[PDB]
Design a protein around this motif. Structure first.
Motif, short mmCIF file in Angstrom:
data_model
loop_
_atom_site.label_atom_id
_atom_site.label_comp_id
_atom_site.label_asym_id
_atom_site.label_seq_id
_atom_site.Cartn_x
_atom_site.Cartn_y
_atom_site.Cartn_z
N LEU A 124 0.85 -1.20 0.00
CA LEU A 124 0.00 0.00 0.00
C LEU A 124 0.86 1.21 0.00
N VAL A 125 0.52 2.16 -0.87
CA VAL A 125 1.14 3.49 -0.81
C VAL A 125 0.16 4.42 -0.12
N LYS A 126 0.58 4.94 1.02
CA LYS A 126 -0.20 5.97 1.75
C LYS A 126 0.79 6.68 2.67
N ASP A 127 0.46 7.93 3.05
CA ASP A 127 1.22 8.72 4.00
C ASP A 127 2.66 8.87 3.58
N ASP A 128 2.86 8.95 2.25
CA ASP A 128 4.24 9.06 1.69
C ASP A 128 5.12 7.88 2.02
N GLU A 129 4.50 6.74 2.27
CA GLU A 129 5.23 5.50 2.56
C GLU A 129 4.81 4.42 1.58
N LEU A 130 5.69 3.45 1.38
CA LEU A 130 5.41 2.21 0.64
C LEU A 130 5.41 1.14 1.71
N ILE A 131 4.19 0.69 2.04
CA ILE A 131 4.00 -0.26 3.15
C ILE A 131 4.02 -1.64 2.46
#
Ligand SMILES: [Br-]
Ligand SMILES: [Br-]
Ligand SMILES: [Br-]
Ligand SMILES: [Br-]
Ligand SMILES: [Br-]
Length: 90
Positions: A72-79
């Protein structure tokens, strides 16, 4: 220039170790991660797609036909959540 921050969840670290110890070659996985980090498009053969249902808003990328990356890409992160065959993960 700035990339998404990697966020490796516990389940991904466990999956990844288990794969490495059985021979997995992470070169394509690292290209795919680098592509996603640069907000660049994945090539069609990865069959990258949004998942439905309880898996929303995660996406599945088929690194190889028997290794999927769920992320998941969210909050400027690649989780990075899971790494393994679709049969083992779903
Ligand atoms: Br394995
Ligand atoms: Br394969
Ligand atoms: Br943020
Ligand atoms: Br999350
Ligand atoms: Br499978």
């Amino acid at each position: 220039s700035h990339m998404l921050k990697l966020n490796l969840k516990k389940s991904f670290q466990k999956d990844f170790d288990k794969l490495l110890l059985n021979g997995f070659d992470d070169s394509v996985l690292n290209e795919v991660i680098l592509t996603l980090r640069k907000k660049e498009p994945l090539d069609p053969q990865f069959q990258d797609h949004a998942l439905k249902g309880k898996w929303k808003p995660f996406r599945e990328c088929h690194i190889k036909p028997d290794v999927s990356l769920v992320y998941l890409v969210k909050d400027d992160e690649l989780i990075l959540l899971r790494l393994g065959s679709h049969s083992e993960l779903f």
